[PDB]
Design a protein around this ligand. Structure first.
Ligand SMILES: [Mn+2]
Ligand SMILES: [Mn+2]
Length: 70
DNA sequence: GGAATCGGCTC
DNA sequence: GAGCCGATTCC
């Protein structure tokens, strides 16, 4: 029941991110990453989460595709 | 009317 | 060609 979502290791504690893989269509392989803020607002793509953080944190070394920090 | 998912357009 | 954003449909 509870899964697919994961906590953010580098971003402030509480941030959750999910990864859905397009299961419909033969072109299977396309996947999208979604991020949820502590307020409950839903976002899609790094550009959306980055705008939410504003200039408080740098996600340059943060790869949303996988959700890891370099 | 809005939200989610899927499709289309541009570089 | 792929990725991201927007539109359409149902309740
Ligand atoms: Mn034309
Ligand atoms: Mn019309």
């Amino acid at each position: 029941d509870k899964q697919g979502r994961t906590d953010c290791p580098a971003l402030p504690p509480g941030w959750k991110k999910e990864e859905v893989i397009r299961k419909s269509g033969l072109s299977a392989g396309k996947s999208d990453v979604y991020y949820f803020s502590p307020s409950g607002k839903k976002f899609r793509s790094k550009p959306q989460l980055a705008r939410y953080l504003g200039n408080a944190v740098d996600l340059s070394c943060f790869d949303f595709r996988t959700g890891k920090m370099m």
